[PDB]
Write a protein that binds this ligand. Sequence first.
Ligand SMILES: [Zn+2]
Ligand SMILES: [Zn+2]
Ligand SMILES: [Zn+2]
Ligand SMILES: [Zn+2]
Lengths: 516, 119, 83, 99, 180, 35, 87, 116, 534
Amino acid sequence: KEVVVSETPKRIKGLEFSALSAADIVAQSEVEVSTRDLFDLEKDRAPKANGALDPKMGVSSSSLECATCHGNLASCHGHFGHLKLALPVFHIGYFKATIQILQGICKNCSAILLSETDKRQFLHELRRPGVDNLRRMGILKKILDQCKKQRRCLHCGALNGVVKKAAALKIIHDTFRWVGKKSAPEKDIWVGEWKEVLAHNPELERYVKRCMDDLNPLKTLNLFKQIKSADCELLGIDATVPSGRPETYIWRYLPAPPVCIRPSVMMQDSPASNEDDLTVKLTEIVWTSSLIKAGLDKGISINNMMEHWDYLQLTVAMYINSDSVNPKPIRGFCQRLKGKQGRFRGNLSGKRVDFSGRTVISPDPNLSIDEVAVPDRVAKVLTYPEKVTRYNRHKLQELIVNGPNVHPGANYLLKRNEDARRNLRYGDRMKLAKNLQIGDVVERHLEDGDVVLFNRQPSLHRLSILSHYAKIRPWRTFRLNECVCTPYNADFDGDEMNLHVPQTEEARAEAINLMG
Amino acid sequence: MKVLEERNAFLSDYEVLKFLTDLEKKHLWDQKSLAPELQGITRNVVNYLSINKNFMSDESFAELMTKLNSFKLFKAEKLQIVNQLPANMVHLYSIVEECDARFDEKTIEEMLEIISGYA
Amino acid sequence: EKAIPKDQRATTPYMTKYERARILGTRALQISMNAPVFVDLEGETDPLRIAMKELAEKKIPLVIRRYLPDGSFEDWSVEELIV
Amino acid sequence: TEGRSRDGGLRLGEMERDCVIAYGASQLLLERLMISSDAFEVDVCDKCGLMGYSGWCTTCKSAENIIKMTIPYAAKLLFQELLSMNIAPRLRLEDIFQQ
Amino acid sequence: FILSKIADLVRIPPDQFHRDTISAITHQLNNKFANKIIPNVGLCITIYDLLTVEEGQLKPGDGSSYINVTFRAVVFKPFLGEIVTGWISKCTAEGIKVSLLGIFDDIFIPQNMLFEGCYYTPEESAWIWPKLYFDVNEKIRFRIEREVFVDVKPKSEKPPAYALLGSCQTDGMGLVSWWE
Amino acid sequence: FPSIPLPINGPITNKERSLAVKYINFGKTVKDGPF
Amino acid sequence: YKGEVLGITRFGLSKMRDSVLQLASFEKTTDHLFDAAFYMKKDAVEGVSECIILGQTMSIGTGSFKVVKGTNISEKDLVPKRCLFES
Amino acid sequence: PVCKNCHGTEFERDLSNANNDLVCKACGVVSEDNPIVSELESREATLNNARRKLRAVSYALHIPEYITDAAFQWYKLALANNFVQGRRSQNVIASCLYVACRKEKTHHMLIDFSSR
Amino acid sequence: SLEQRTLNPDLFLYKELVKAHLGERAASVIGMLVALGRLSVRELVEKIDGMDVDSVKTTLVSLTQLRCVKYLQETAISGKKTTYYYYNEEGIHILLYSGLIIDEIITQMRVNDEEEHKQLVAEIVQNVISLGSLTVEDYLSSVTSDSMKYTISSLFVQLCEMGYLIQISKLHYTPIEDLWQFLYEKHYKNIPRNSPLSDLKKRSQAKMNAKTDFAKIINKPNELSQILTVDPKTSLRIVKPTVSLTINLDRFMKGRRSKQLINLAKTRVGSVTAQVYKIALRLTEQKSPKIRDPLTQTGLLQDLEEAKSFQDEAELVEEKTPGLTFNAIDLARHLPSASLINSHLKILASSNFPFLNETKPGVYYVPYSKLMPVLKSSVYEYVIASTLGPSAMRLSRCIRDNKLVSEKIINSTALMKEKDIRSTLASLIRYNSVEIQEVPRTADRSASRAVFLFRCKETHSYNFMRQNLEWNMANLLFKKEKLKQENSTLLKKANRDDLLPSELNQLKMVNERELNVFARLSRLLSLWEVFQMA
Ligand SMILES: [Zn+2]
Ligand SMILES: [Zn+2]
Ligand SMILES: [Zn+2]
Ligand SMILES: [Zn+2]
C-alpha cells in the first residue's frame, strides 16, 4: 505494501575529481586482510581464511558464491577491502604534487612563506567569475616562486632554503643558504650540535658536508597536520569538504580492490591457478607491514627496520606504477591503462561488437547499388529482434513455424513475461506458435530489404563506411556491385572485410538516411 | 514529485459520495454484475460512509450548515458534525472544548433540532 | 530563456537532413510499440517503410523544439517544414 | 572474444569510430558501442555519489538515494580501478527533463 | 476529503494514442496511486482533477512521450480530535486492535486515558467492568490524537507506515449503542 | 579499544563542583534568552 | 582563438582545451589525472569523446535538438470540479 | 542446475550456431546467456631436500617421472607416521622407491639400488 | 568514532562552541570564515546556502553583540565601501573560560566575607557579557529601583579599577594587523618627498613613528584617566555612567598565568615557602608583562635585527618597571619578620629555576622572559612520565642536554638494557619528541648503509601537543551535546514545569556523568593553556 514509489530517470551533468580521506577507505570497505597467505592447507576447493581472495570480498570463479551481495558470477559487482599500514609512506602519484606544496610552507612553524598583505592580493585573482584552468594553473606558478624567493618565515623567522629530490624517490631540503653572513644562530647551533659527535668516531669528517636533514613521511605528516584550513586555497586545495586536508595525500591506509579487477585466471596447464601479479604484490605489502609492526613492538634495530620501511616505500611505488623499478617487469595499474591498445583505444574508444561476420568479397554486376548480396549460411546465424504488432502478426505467425532450419525463420524468442530467452530447436514450435502475445519481441533471421552497414579496415575517410540494403544468396561469399569499390579502394586480390547489423529501430532508420 | 500544498482545500463528505457515484456509474455496471484492485477500494468508500448516513439534496445541506457556524472565529468544528452521532448532544459535549461554559442558551437546542432534523 | 512564438521565428523553414533522419527514427519504433497508424496502409510490413510513407502525406503528430545556443526555445511543427 | 577459433566478435576501432561522427549519427554510435557490445546496469547513489551493489549505498549506509541507470561495463571497471588508488570520482546528476 | 496540490511526471506507452489526452493521464496515474500511501502526507485514493498540463517530451532511447503534470487528489485527513465510528475484528492482551474494516487495518490504538481497573480477561471480554460489553463487527466510537509517519527501509509484520493514536477517555466510548 | 589513557580521571571535588554549576546556567541564560 | 600560437602536441593540448578524461585518451594519461584530482577539478561532460565513455546522447549531429509530442489540448476542458467549499 | 519453468536437471550447451548458450531439452528456456570464458617450514624444507634425492637416482636408473612423483606420497605418509626418525635418510627413500617400482610392475630390481 | 578522529583541526573546536550554547544557524557561518579566511556578505551568501541575505545579517548581529567576530572597512577608488569581516579568536575564548571567571572574582577579591553580593557578583559576569556589551544604565534600570544601588554602583569601581573591565572601542573590535597598515601609511604620508638621502632609512622613518604610535594607541583603552567621574554630590568617586564596557581577557590570562607559576613552587618547595610566594605573587598581578605580546603578532618578525628588538627592549622594560620591583620589606604586613621575609626568599635564588634569581641588591623582582620557557619544558616531560613509562622521562632528558645523541652514547650516557629502549624510543618517534638525522655514507642515501642521529627540536614537539589537546577539548565537547539529544523529551518536561517516580532515575545518572565532564575539562584546559605563552 500500500505504498507508492516514484523516481525520474536522470542524466550526468559532469564528473568531478577528488581524493577521498583515509576514513573513507574503511567507510566503504567491509573485509580486512591482516593475514598473509592466500591458500590454507585445508586442501579444500576454496581455502581462503581472512587475507586472500575472500568470498565476501567478491568472486573470481563461476563455481563460487559472493557472500555479500549475492550471486555466482553475474550478480556480483565486486566489493572493496582495506589495508592498515604500520607507518605511512608517500604517494607515488602525488609525489610531484606533494613536493611543490612543501616549497611554499615554513619548515619550523609550518606557515606559508608570505606576508599578510601580500597573500591578500593573490586570492583576489581567484574570486572573479572568469577563471579558466589555463589561468588557474598559470597564476599558481607565481605563488610558489614568491615563497621560494623568501628565505625566513614570519612566525618564528626560521631560514628556509630549497627542497628537491635525492636522485631512491626520497627528497632532501637544502636548508643552508649563506652568501657571506655566517653569523646566524641556527648555523652556530648547527656546528655546536655537530661537535658533540665529533669526539667519537671522527672518520665521518668527509661526510659532514654531505650530511643534511631529511624529510621522511612520518615527519611530514605532522608537518602537514599543523597547517591550517584558512590558507589552503592559495596552493591548490579547497576547504569545506571532508577530504580537504592535505594529510590524505600520502598513503596511510590503502583500499583493496575487488577480485573482479584481478581475476584468478586458470590457464589449465595444471590443476593450480596461475594467480596474477596484482595479488602477489599486494601480498608482499601486507607481509612487509606485518613484520615492521611486530618488529618495533618486540624491539629490533633502527638500522634494520628502516630499510624494511624503505622497501615497503618502494613496494607501494610499484603496485600503482612499475616505471620506478629502476632495474619480465611486473605489470601495474599505470602499465595497463596507457600504451598502444592497452586501454582507452582498444577498450574505451574502439570496442568489440556482437553480430558481425567476416568473409571475402566478390564482384557482381547483376545486383544494384545500395544493396549487398548476403550469403545464406550466415543469414541463419546473424539475427534481428522484431517486436510483434497487429500489422506483422500474420507474417510473424508464418515466420515462427519455419524455425532455424529453413532460412526465413527464427532462432530464439522473448515473451513479454519471459525473462531471458527461449530456444526454438528444443520443444514444440507450432503449439508455441499459436499463442504469440502481441507485447513481446521475436528473433528472426536476416532477409532482403534490411539495413546492413559495411566497412573497410583501413579507414582513410568517412566514406570508408556505408550502409546498404540486403539480399540473401545461396553462395558462400560477399557479392558487391562494381561501382562501390572506389571509396573502399578494394581490389578483390584476396582481402576480406566484415559487415555489421544494428539491432534497434532508430538505428535501422538512421543508417539509411545518413550513410546510405 | 513535489507537494505544493498539503492542505489545499476542504471538501464535504457529500461529494465523497457524489462525484464517486458518477465514477461508479460509468464503471461497467457495478454491484449488479453478479449474474481491478481500485474498484473494490472505491466501492468500499461508497458503501461504508453511506450506511452511516442512512442507518437527498445538497441545497438542504447548505441551509442548515449556514446556520450552524455562528461562531466568531473558531468555527472549523462545523464541518465535522455531519455524520458523527446525530441527534445527540452528550456527544457534542465531547466533540468541542469550552462549549459547556459558553453555550448555555437556546442555541444548543436550536443546534439540536438542526442535527436531529438532519437525521 | 522561454518559449518564443511565431513573431520571433527567425530560422530556416526547411526540414534538414538531421531532422528527417530523427523523426523516422522516433516514429518507427512506436509502430513496433503498437501505436495506431494514420495513413491508408496496404498489406505491408517493416514499420520503417510505413513510417517513410507517412512522411509523404505529412501526417506525423509531432513537433520539433530547436534550441538556440543562448538557451532559448524555438518550436517547429513537423508539417511546417518542407523538403 | 578476439579470435576466429575464440568465436570472434570483431573490434570496431578508433579510426572507424571517428567516421561515424563525421556522419553526425548519434544513436547507433551509442548502440554499437555499448548496446551491441558492453551493456551493463549500475545503480548509483545521488549524494556522495558513487556506485553501490544490488540495493545498497555502503558509503552513507541508508540505501535510499539510489538511481537506477546503465553504463558501459568497460566504464564500470574504469572508475573502479582509479578508486584503487586515492582518487574519488564524485558523480553529479541532473534530470533529463525540465530544462 | 481534503485536497493536496502536488506535482509529478507521468509516462504513457505508445499504444494508448487512440485514447484522448486526459483519460489516459487519468488511467496511468490511477494504478500508480491506487490505494497508495504518501511519504509523510497520507493516502490519496483517487485523483480529483487536473490543474494544468504541459507538453509531452520524449526520451531519445525510449520513444514514448513523458508529461509532467500538476494536480490535486482527494485524501482523508480527519482531525487531531476527530470522532470516528469504526469497527473492530481483533483483540490482544496489551491494548486493543481497533481497525476500520474495509479500507485499512494497520492500526493499533492504546487505552492510555482511561481508569485504573483496565487489564485483559481471556473470557471474550476486554476486562471486567464495575455496562454492556462490545465485540467485533459493530459500530464502535473512537477518536484520534496523533499519528506516526516513518519511511525507513532497514534491509539486512507491523507496518509502521500509517499508524494512529486513539483513546476511550470519556463515557460511551466502546460502543455507539451505549448512547442514543 | 584504544589503550594509554590520560592521568586526569577523578571524582569531582566540591571545590570545582560549584564551578561546574556555573556552566549549565550560563548557556541557559543565552539559549532561553534572545538567541 | 585563445590568443597565442600553440601546437597539437602534449604542450599544445595542455593549453588549448582542458578536459581531464578526454586528456586521458591522449598519450600521457597519469600526469593529467593526479594533479586534477589534487586540484579536485570539475568538468562538465559535453565532449563527443566524453559522451561515448559514459554512454549518453551525443550533442552533435542529430542529437542537438530534442523531440516533443504535441498535447493538442487547451484550457477549454481544464476547469476544476471544486464545489461547496464551506457553505 | 534447476530450470525456472520445468525445473529440469539436464542442461545442454548448444554449439550449433556458435552462441554456446545453455538450455534444457524439455521446454527450451535458456539457462545462461553470453558465456564468460576464463581468458611446517622445517617440514617443507625436509621434503624439498627429499625431492632432490628422489630426482637424483631416478636420473641414474632412468626412472620415468610418474613413479618419482607417485613415490613422494608414499614418502609423505610415512613422514607423518614417524618412520623417518632414527633411520638413515639415504636408506629409507630407496626402500620407498621399490614400493612404487613393484606397484608399477617394472623391470627394476632391488640390488641396483644398494650397489649404488 | 573513527569518523571524528581524522578530519578535525581546531575548526571542529571553533564550530561547536556556538553550537553548544547559541542558536544553530550561527554554527554554519562561523565555520565558513575560519575555513575561508576573510570575506564580506556579498560573497558570504554564495558560500552558504539556506540562509537569506538579511537572515545572514539577522544571524551576524548575534555574534556581533557577543564580540565573536571583528570587522574591517575598505573602500575602493571606483567601488563603494566594502566591509570585510574577520574572526575574533579571543571573544570565543570567553565562551571557553566562561565558568572560570566566576572562580576568579572570588579568589582575587578577598577583602569581603559573608557579603550579600556573593550571589550578585557571581551574576555580574553573567550580566556583563551574556548580554554582549554592557553600560551602567542597563543594571540600574532593572527591577530593583534602588535596593541600595549606590552601594552596588560603588562596588564596581572596586571591581573595575583592579582591571579587566576596560572600556570597549573599535580597538577591541578590530584585529591587530588591519589597524597597523593605515597608521603606518599615516606616518608615511607625514614624510613627503624632498628628503632623498638614505631612502631605505626614510622608509623606516615612518616605522620608528609607528612603534611609538602602536604602544600609545594600545594604551588608550588601558588609560584609566577617563573611565571615572569625580562626583561632588551624593558620592566621592564613581565610574562614568556613559561607558560601554565588557571584560578584558588580558588581566585574567596574566592572572591565570599567575596561578600556573605557583604550582611549580608547590612541587619545588614545601608548604611554607609556597605560602610565602603566593602573597607576593598577587601584588604584581594588576601590572604585569603582557602574555600575548602584541608587538610580535604580525610584522617584521622575519628579520633577526628586528626580531631581537622585540625582547631586547622587553627585557629592559621588565627589568626597569617600577610597579613590580618590591623591596621585600612590605611583604611582612601583607602576610596574616623581615629576617624571615629575607630568609625564606633566599631559597628562591638558590634554586636553578630563575624566579627571584637575578636582581639589584636590596630590591627583588621575578623575571618573566627567561622563566616561561622553563615551565613549558617542565610539565610536558612530566606528562611523558604521567601517561607513559618513566624510562622515556630518562630518555627525554638524555637527548635534551646531549645535543646530537648517537645510538652508542645513549647506552654510555643513559644506563638501561638494549631491548627495553626499543620499546620506549619507538613510541617517541610516533609522538614526535625525538626526530631523525641521517648521515649518507654511501651513494644515493642508502637506508641500510646509514646510521641515524637524534634531536629534541623544541618547536615541533609542542605544536603536535597543542592540536592534540585542541581536539581532546572538542572531543569531550562532542560527548556533551550528543547526550542531550537522547532523553530530550523529559528535559523538555524538566523545563516546562519551572512527576513520574521511575522516570526521574534516568535524569540523574545522565546528570552525574556530565558533571565529571566539566571537571576533567577544567583539569584538561589548565594543561593546555601553559603552551599559549608564545
Ligand atoms: Zn557480495
Ligand atoms: Zn617558522
Ligand atoms: Zn553516495
Ligand atoms: Zn528447463
